[PDB]
Amino acid sequence: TLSGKTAIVGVAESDQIGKVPDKPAIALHAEAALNALEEAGLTLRDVDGLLTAGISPLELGEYLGIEPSYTDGTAVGSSFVIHLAHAAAAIVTGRCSVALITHGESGRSRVGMPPPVGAYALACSRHMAEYGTTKEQLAEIAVATRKWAMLNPKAYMRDPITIEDVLNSRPIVWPFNLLDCCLVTDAGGACVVTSIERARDLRQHPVAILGVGESHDHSIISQMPSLTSFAARRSGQAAFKMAGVTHDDIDLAMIYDSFTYTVLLSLEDLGFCAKGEGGAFVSGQRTAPGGDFPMNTNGGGLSYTHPGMYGMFAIIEAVRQLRHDYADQGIRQVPNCELAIVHGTGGVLSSAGTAILGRV
16 A cells, blocks of 8 residues: 555666766765756755665765755665665655655776675576576577667667677676676666655656565575575565556566576566576567567666666666657667566575556
8 A cells, every 4th residue: 555655756877877987976876866856857955855775875965965854774785676665655654755766886996995606606507407497598688688788878788799699708607608797887876756646746757656575585594595586586476466467567677687597587586487487488589679578678787787786777767668768769668668567686596676667
């Protein structure tokens, strides 16, 4: 019953992303915030809620020069969509009314900073041995996601690639090659949330927060998960249930892609395909532009931007697709974008957050 009562009214990245020398994390957050507010037709003066990942809410509020009634920070740790849930709750209960959420860091340049892949590699290799998942099937994800990156001016990688290019790319930690792994960029991202009522009186087509789920395993666990993230299953189910929609109603999937494997497994854990059959699911470029299952339409962490484990960049693109922001630009726009799912599996497959958003 938090479902539908709040909406995203503004989304923005920092002024620049990718390689941004000399701009610290706090500045990247600030820019994104200002940009998201202006898009909605609001200003810093309207903001009374501040939620952050990559920087302290105290520090950022001071830097923007605001004194919000509600704050929420992230433990330094991941944050995908938990801030949407916290913001919606804070609005409904009236601890705030205009919630500003900001993510990001100077991942590449590490401006103003003082001078675990093996586990994912092992999980992937186990999936390969247990289910017959192939390097070729995992490469499809990189290839399809790169095709989306080519349609996006802000994407860091825009050279087209083939399955073979991926297999021949530089090995990092077996079975991952370079094109199986996310980028390391400088980037800030931000969005603004209000009540659905107040959202109807603002500039952009509103995007309703319809379902959120979050879960993590106990801090003490005897075995690193491998073949499935139970946390992702739990968060997925709660989001579907809160929203009261089906898998078939989903028009767009944004899925955190620290690795090609992370995407494949998340699709399985979310229940878009059966356990062990994610490889077949992604084949035939099903997720590329014009395919049956559009995924990571901005280019994702693999080819667009990735300053760290942050869900805001996926949220931003999901909103844009849902508002039909890309109407002009042909295949870039996802056909009939009514419902989108945003998901991230983090930790060591030990945490996850899932959100369902809708074109009101």
